[PDB]
Design a protein around this ligand. Structure first.
Ligand SMILES: *[C@@H]1O[C@H](CO)[C@@H](O[C@@H]2O[C@H](CO)[C@@H](O)[C@H](O)[C@H]2NC(C)=O)[C@H](O)[C@H]1NC(C)=O
Ligand SMILES: CC(=O)N[C@@H]1[C@@H](O)[C@H](O)[C@@H](CO)O[C@H]1O
Ligand SMILES: CC(=O)N[C@@H]1[C@@H](O)[C@H](O)[C@@H](CO)O[C@H]1O
Lengths: 681, 49
């Protein structure tokens, strides 16, 4: 295989608002023959071209003739864009030097067409809304007004809207991974086994997955529960290492999570009905005769618990276990903590703060087996109204509302949170005894979507763990595909600018995304439908932020370089020290949050190596290859720091800075940011 | 596995396990698992074989 003439380019990157970067182009003649190549670039009004070498045409070179061909530009349009340059040779022009063949084959002209991305100005985010309509062979409508433009930014804020029902899980590349007996300490045992147990439910329940990593996990699970023989308590309770702590309760997710699947796992190897009942008898003992018994949360690790220690929410977490077992006097007992939850639902009716994790989880589950819980096919809608990942991400902020009582939506539980949540969402959805063809599906199938677009088995997530929880999302659908969802759904999409688009849905439009945006700074969205059954469509509003924000609570200590380049060698090499902490980090979770990325044309290596060394007595040696993660050690009492540099991949930079700063500490506090760019300029 | 067993020497003690659950701790779970074995065997109608 051969071609003598091949192109090389300068990648800017996904880059800044300014677009005068340093665009060049180089081809090289590996053929011995010195040939002219007439070159130019096909431009458009999509961008603001500037000819550097205006007067002269890149003209003509010889074998291994190196040449650089660099214009200037400064576009207006944002997002990815294909850039079209072309190079071709002309004949009968033996005037460069001696002679010019200019005689290729059909491979005549060197032509190059390059999708490059600009990151717009400021910082990026989105806002959105959530709406359903369900006429039963009738008609219903709704109006949505979609606006929070404060501190507004030029030409940044856009949107779209859709709905879906997809069937036929195509593939499984989100499936595979593994970890095992860890090396640092014994505390990770809790995080090890818990999702590791529900893997058993996955082998048949996909028709795409990779079961044998889970049919080997049985070979692991055949030792998994053995650690739980030891990590239990004699009286019945359970701890990270077990008993020697007598007359108390203990955390009960990781058991209640399994205590059903112990009973799905009491088939291969025999754990008896005595191990489940001793687990149970622990629980009934604690149920007060009158009160919702007092219990305090200070247990062995928030590593496993992204938790704020609410016994009442946990007073439900027993009752899910109680639904598992068919004792049926038990089932009255779950109505006890139900009425403890009835308080917590009046909380979640007003919708101010109940921590948006748990009353979620099991209210759905609570009556999941019975058969008359129509009432609960309502209350999920909150939870799906509750900033759910209709876009298959719960991206990063609260709407624009500073006040004290706010939800678990911008908290330092930082796995990126979009997978922990939807787990216990979809787990609630389609356990329907009846057909859940109504609105607890069309979003359920949304959850199938990006888990089916989450096709990378690296495991280097925004977390480490969390994508183990990405899977049940895929898994439990495996019979949900046995469904029918299609009716006279006729969809009206109208706004104020005399615009109105129409869409429609059916069993074959069931799986059909209907994307459409608008340019309106106004956001105002009436909608109206008909048909039979229910369906939830969805909003999304993208936009930039951070034109120039002020200082705020949070303390981020950063230093880039010795205060200036002031030397020709610099503008390339300078180590950037960062030294950070925020006091409010109290009984919520492990330490998960960080954000460290480069500037537009700036590439790290020793940064790879300085992070590589760091072990401040605890660590997960985690890294993104553009970012850094050693955080669950300890939070903010005594900060710490490092230093790391780049190489200037950007010879020329339109003067627009860059900052990568993340922050989430407490439910009432204001913005609480601290930022600083690179100074060399 | 799926059988009964002689039950004097346990029933003899299974009270005194409960008199003996004071010095060293055998739990209320050891007496009830001992018990739950028994209720399982009680036929619904017969004086089980
Ligand atoms: C920061 O670290 C200090 C280290 O002493 C912690 O100090 C404790 O303060 C709590 C609450 O005032 C007391 O109950 C303890 O007696 C102190 N030492 C301990 C834990 O025995 C402090 O809790 C840490 N966090 C912050 C910023 O309060
Ligand atoms: C639609 C668009 O972006 N235009 C092209 C696209 O066809 C191509 O796939 C891409 C590289 O993947 O280069 C650009
Ligand atoms: C274990 C077994 O019976 N096989 C099940 C089958 O019944 C089910 O329909 C399919 C889709 O969920 O997954 C598998």
């Amino acid at each position: 295989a051969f071609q003598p003439f091949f192109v090389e380019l300068t990648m800017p990157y996904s880059v800044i608002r300014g677009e005068a970067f340093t665009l060049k182009a180089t081809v090289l003649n590996y053929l011995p023959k010195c040939i002219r190549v007439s070159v130019q670039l096909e431009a458009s009004p999509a961008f603001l071209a500037v000819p550097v070498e205006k007067e002269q045409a890149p003209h003509c070179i010889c074998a291994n003739g190196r040449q650089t061909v660099s214009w200037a530009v400064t576009p207006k349009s944002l997002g990815n864009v294909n850039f079209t340059v072309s190079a071709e040779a002309l004949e009968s022009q033996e005037l460069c030097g001696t002679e010019v063949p200019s005689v290729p084959e059909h491979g005549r002209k060197d032509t190059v067409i390059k999708p490059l991305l600009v990151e717009p100005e400021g910082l990026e985010k989105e806002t959105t809304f959530n709406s359903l309509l369900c006429p039963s062979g009738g008609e219903v409508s709704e109006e949505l007004s979609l606006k929070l433009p404060p501190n507004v930014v030029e030409e940044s804020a856009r949107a779209s809207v859709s709905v879906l029902g997809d069937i036929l899980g195509s593939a499984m590349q989100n499936t595979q991974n593994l970890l095992q007996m860890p090396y640092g300490c014994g505390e990770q045992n809790m995080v090890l086994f818990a999702p590791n147990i529900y893997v058993l439910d996955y082998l048949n329940e996909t028709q795409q997955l990779t079961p044998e990593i889970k049919s080997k996990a049985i070979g692991y699970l055949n030792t998994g529960y053995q650690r739980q023989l030891n990590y239990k308590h004699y009286d019945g309770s359970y701890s990270t290492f077990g008993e020697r702590y007598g007359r108390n309760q203990g955390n009960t997710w990781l058991t209640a999570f399994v205590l059903k699947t112990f009973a799905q796992a009491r088939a291969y190897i025999f754990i008896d009905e005595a191990h489940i009942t001793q687990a149970l008898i622990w629980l009934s003992q604690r149920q007060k005769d009158n009160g919702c018994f007092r219990s305090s949360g200070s247990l062995l690790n928030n590593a496993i618990k992204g938790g704020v220690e609410d016994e009442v929410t946990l007073s439900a977490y027993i009752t899910i276990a109680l639904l598992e077992i068919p004792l049926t006097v038990t089932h009255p007992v779950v109505r006890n903590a139900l009425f403890c939850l009835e308080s917590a639902w009046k909380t979640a009716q007003e919708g101010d703060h109940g921590s948006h994790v748990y009353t979620k989880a099991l209210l759905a589950y609570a009556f999941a087996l019975a058969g008359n819980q129509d009432k609960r096919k309502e209350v999920l809608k909150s939870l799906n109204e509750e900033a759910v990942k209709k876009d298959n991400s719960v991206h990063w902020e609260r709407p624009q509302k500073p006040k004290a009582p706010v939800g678990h939506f911008y908290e330092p539980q930082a796995p990126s949170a979009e997978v922990e949540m939807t787990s216990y969402v979809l787990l609630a959805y389609l356990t329907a005894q009846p057909a859940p063809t109504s609105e607890d599906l069309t979003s359920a199938t949304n959850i199938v979507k990006w888990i089916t677009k989450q096709q990378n088995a690296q495991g280097g997530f925004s977390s480490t763990q969390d994508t183990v929880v990405a899977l049940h999302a895929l898994s439990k659908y495996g019979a949900a595909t046995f469904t029918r969802t299609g009716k006279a759904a006729q969809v009206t999409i109208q706004s104020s600018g005399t615009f109105s688009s129409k869409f429609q849905v059916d069993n074959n439009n069931r799986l059909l995304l209907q994307q459409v945006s608008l340019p309106e700074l106004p956001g105002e969205y009436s909608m109206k439908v008909t048909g039979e059954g229910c369906v939830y469509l969805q909003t999304s509003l993208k936009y930039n932020i951070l034109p120039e924000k002020e200082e705020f609570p949070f303390a981020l200590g950063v230093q880039t370089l010795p205060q200036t380049c002031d030397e020709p060698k610099a503008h390339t090499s300078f180590q950037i020290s960062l030294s950070v902490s925020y006091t409010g980090s109290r009984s919520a979770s492990n330490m998960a949050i960080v954000d460290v990325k480069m500037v537009s044309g700036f590439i790290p290596l020793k940064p790879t190596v300085k992070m590589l060394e760091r072990s401040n007595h605890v660590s997960r040696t985690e890294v993104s290859s553009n970012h850094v993660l050693i955080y669950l050690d300890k939070v903010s009492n005594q900060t710490l720091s490092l230093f790391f540099t780049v190489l200037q991949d950007v010879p020329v930079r339109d003067l627009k800075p860059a900052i990568v700063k993340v922050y989430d500490y407490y439910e009432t506090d204001e913005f609480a940011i601290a930022e600083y760019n690179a100074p060399c300029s």
